[PDB]
Amino acid sequence: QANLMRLKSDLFNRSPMYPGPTKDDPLTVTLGFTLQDIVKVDSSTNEVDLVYYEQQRWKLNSLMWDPNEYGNITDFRTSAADIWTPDITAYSSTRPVQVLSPQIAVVTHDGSVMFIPAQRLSFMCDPTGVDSEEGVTCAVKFGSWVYSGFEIDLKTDTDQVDLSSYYASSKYEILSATQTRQVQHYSCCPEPYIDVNLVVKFRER
Amino acid sequence: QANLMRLKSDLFNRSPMYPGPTKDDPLTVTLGFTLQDIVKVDSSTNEVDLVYYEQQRWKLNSLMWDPNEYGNITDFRTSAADIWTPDITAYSSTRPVQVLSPQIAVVTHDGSVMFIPAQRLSFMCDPTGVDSEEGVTCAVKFGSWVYSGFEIDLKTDTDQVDLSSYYASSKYEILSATQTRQVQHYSCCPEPYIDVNLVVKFRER
Amino acid sequence: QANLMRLKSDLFNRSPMYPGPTKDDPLTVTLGFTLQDIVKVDSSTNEVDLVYYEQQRWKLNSLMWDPNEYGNITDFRTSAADIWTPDITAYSSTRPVQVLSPQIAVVTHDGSVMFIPAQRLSFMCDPTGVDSEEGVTCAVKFGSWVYSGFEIDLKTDTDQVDLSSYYASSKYEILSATQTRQVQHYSCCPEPYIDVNLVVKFRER
Amino acid sequence: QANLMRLKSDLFNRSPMYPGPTKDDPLTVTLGFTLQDIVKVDSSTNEVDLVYYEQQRWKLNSLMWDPNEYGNITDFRTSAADIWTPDITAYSSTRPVQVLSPQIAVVTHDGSVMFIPAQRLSFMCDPTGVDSEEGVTCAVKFGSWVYSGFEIDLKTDTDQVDLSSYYASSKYEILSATQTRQVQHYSCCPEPYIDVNLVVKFRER
Amino acid sequence: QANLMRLKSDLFNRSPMYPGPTKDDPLTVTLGFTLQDIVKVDSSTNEVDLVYYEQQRWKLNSLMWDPNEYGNITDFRTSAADIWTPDITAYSSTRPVQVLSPQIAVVTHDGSVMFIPAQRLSFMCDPTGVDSEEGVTCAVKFGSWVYSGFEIDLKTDTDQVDLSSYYASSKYEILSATQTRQVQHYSCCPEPYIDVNLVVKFRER
Ligand SMILES: O=C(O[C@H]1C[C@H]2CC[C@@H](C1)N2C[C@H](O)c1ccccc1)c1ccccc1
Ligand SMILES: O=C(O[C@H]1C[C@H]2CC[C@@H](C1)N2C[C@H](O)c1ccccc1)c1ccccc1
Ligand SMILES: O=C(O[C@H]1C[C@H]2CC[C@@H](C1)N2C[C@H](O)c1ccccc1)c1ccccc1
């Protein structure tokens, strides 16, 4: 255990704190969604609840090491409190997001980080026509709140949201689920801002 | 990254803590509102829920630097925990305000600070006549709870509320919305207190 | 700002922790109420909700200074976390009190402290006859949970509650509201305990 | 105040942490209940809500002192965070207990500790027949979750629950209320476990 | 008490932090369930609430000692905050789990740890046919969120869930209850992940 304890000590306690991405040192984050369930729809306030888990991937030079020097260690698990994390937020949320999983991430010797947080979200969506055979469609945007496109960029490995873990006896059937990257231009700010737009079509079971 | 790490170290770790504005050395905060949605109205308790995001701007001499000495760095992002923030509160709230965005602010080399917090608020408002063609009007005041006029002052760049991001399929239509500065005298206290009055006119879609 | 930073350093960091009033060092706290609104009444559980703000005043010798020695500073604002505060509680509450304002207090050079906390409270009250012209009356007691009369005493500047900020379009009109000091003798303890009784008479709008 | 500050420093900062009771060195806790109100009964889930305050008494040799050596000080108030406290829990609760009072305890020169916490509790109880003249009866057990009988023992000064502070206009009348000590044997574990069973008989007013 | 204080000091303060299991130093956790009550079923969102307590057992070499050297001490109780704990999570939860018991664990001289946490959980379950004589069946999986099989394995002493403490007057009758170990293979990852599946059969009184 001595080698892992030493590597951790050298990485986090010796060196100073990482101050995030800049225009000179930008980074890209890969996003992915696994939809688990549509728990409820509120027709009187136009609010819809989702249960899912997000995939977050990024790489930093400040986090890499030589495995040979630390007794052939390629990777390790660490609390998300010990490392820098991106600030990915939902634009149309109506209540604070609830966390449903432990906050631990995995770090590999090349500097790659993987973080998989599970959560419940309430957002703006009109459910009129969910009782029909054709169904109703809704969308929600995810992205960094404070950083532009010159500091953080976003990427998706596929445009098909993972439905391999969707609840079979849910009150609502999934007709389509997509994850597409998009660019925005805001009046306030002269820089573009990048997002990933989650679009879902569904109906009553 | 060494230069940004150095600037941050010199600003926050070397010098002591800023003890807030005084009567001798006072400051001014600029406010602005972006209304997103009227989620629900409760006719039985006269309570109304609002989802929006606030614009906060102030300047401090203790936060400025020469970009030339720190490798031509003009600005940076930092956690709101690291810097002093104004104590802006709503006078007619009925439940504690819910935060819906990350707490990160931006600092420029001249000492200017920008902070944009997203939140949900419940306040006192009679909705009688929202079902009419003319609609109903309500208001809520914002300002520093503990600081007087001789300590903190308020300013608005415009009188019109930003409605460019208002939810298109909301159950309620916005007829008018304004942000206007006020100066008040309370019975308790011999000093005046400044606030910004948010007045919204709406009806059923 | 150097003088205020120095005064604060000398008061809180040099000297040791204040261990609360004793029988050889007792203190008196002044109380006062500003009623804002009666939000709801529950006839099925006999519970009533209130929104208001309290006035707290006390003096300590450990907090006084000479303004002349610290560049003519008479007073300053500080987080309630930095100073000792009285343990004032409501005897008939049914749910934990919600805080609705920042926790900042003001300290003057003579050692006087002023703290104004805003809050929402749920307490025991039978609302039978609120629909009548005569209305219904209810009461709630406030005071120190642990400290007796030989450690902490209470005082009120007036016996009339401040109704100058009561919500005009509330579902309930106030007929009368009063604040009066009481001395209680409990079976548990040979010492007496001091409290202030808030009595409100109201009816439907 | 110098003497009290000194005594506190010598007790908590000089000596090491108390590691809780053992087999070779056990202790006894005295319990007592003051019933304030039965707030609501839920016939659809068989859940009942109670508002009350508990009496906790224990003695430790590590907490005693000579008053003569510390300027004739017999007792003092201290935050429950500074001292060891027993882990008394409710076996049939359905939601986490809500605290309704400050967490301060009193310590005397002989080593005796007194702690009086006020709280709201939801537990399993079938209310069928509360509308009858005979009424309905329910019970709930309190005791240490982790320590057996060979480490912690329990005691009651009386078997008659204190009803001198029960809410006069409650929707429910108290017929009888008792506090009795019990010794349990669980299938899992070879040691005996002690508890105090609270039994209440009530009906509609 | 000097010996126990010394043992605790030598174990936690002298040696460095345990960095969690690895492929070179893996461990196994034993699980067990005691079902207490089915509090409510929501047919409109397909959500079910459970109240129970879990059994957790694991062994570490970093936690063993010679009783002879520490005055014949075989075991002791300690706060779960002082030791490493497994990240055992429910896959189909819809709201954050509520804790209903103190967080204390027991450590024996051979390095074995026992932790018994009590909790309330809301998960995905279709209750259609609970009103029938045959009843309805539902399931939920438990296991570590981040560690694979080569780091954490699971075990059960029996396949029958403990029903000796199930609430007699519950609105729902239990007909069956089993705990069974499973091995999952995920696309994302190259190692197999283990879980323990909880299956309950029930109906209305
Ligand atoms: O910088 C600002 O806002 C931040 C940048 C953008 C715009 C609002 C919010 C905060 N950011 C949105 C973010 O890019 C986002 C977009 C879509 C989904 C998630 C996050 C700003 C806006 C108005 C006035 C002054 C400053
Ligand atoms: O300082 C006081 O009041 C504080 C200052 C002002 C007045 C009430 C509240 C607390 N503060 C209001 C603040 O100026 C404000 C106004 C409008 C919207 C938000 C905050 C005070 C109150 C009662 C007795 C003694 C002193
Ligand atoms: O010290 C006790 O309780 C404290 C003293 C009194 C009684 C309850 C509570 C805590 N104190 C009441 C408090 O002074 C108060 C009364 C009314 C409104 C607010 C606070 C006590 C009670 C019963 C048995 C042994 C000790």
Ligand SMILES: O=C(O[C@H]1C[C@H]2CC[C@@H](C1)N2C[C@H](O)c1ccccc1)c1ccccc1
């Ligand atoms: O020690 C255990 O549980 C603790 C001891 C007992 C049994 C459950 C709970 C926790 N304890 C009950 C406790 O004595 C109690 C009883 C009544 C009211 C409060 C606490 C245990 C249970 C099952 C398998 C292995 C170990």
Ligand SMILES: O=C(O[C@H]1C[C@H]2CC[C@@H](C1)N2C[C@H](O)c1ccccc1)c1ccccc1
């Ligand atoms: O490693 C991953 O996720 C972890 C492994 C598995 C799958 C989700 C979660 C985190 N783990 C589930 C866990 O094994 C579990 C299974 C059953 C009950 C509780 C926990 C992952 C998932 C998607 C894309 C890239 C990487």
Ligand SMILES: [Cl-]
């Ligand atoms: Cl709900």
Ligand SMILES: [Cl-]
């Ligand atoms: Cl920003």
Ligand SMILES: [Cl-]
């Ligand atoms: Cl709601």
Ligand SMILES: [Cl-]
């Ligand atoms: Cl409500």
Ligand SMILES: [Cl-]
């Ligand atoms: Cl103030």
Ligand SMILES: [Cl-]
């Ligand atoms: Cl929107």
Ligand SMILES: [Cl-]
């Ligand atoms: Cl007390």
Ligand SMILES: [Cl-]
């Ligand atoms: Cl309620």
Ligand SMILES: [Cl-]
């Ligand atoms: Cl409920």
Ligand SMILES: [Cl-]
């Ligand atoms: Cl145990």
Ligand SMILES: [Cl-]
């Ligand atoms: Cl870990």
Ligand SMILES: [Cl-]
């Ligand atoms: Cl992972």
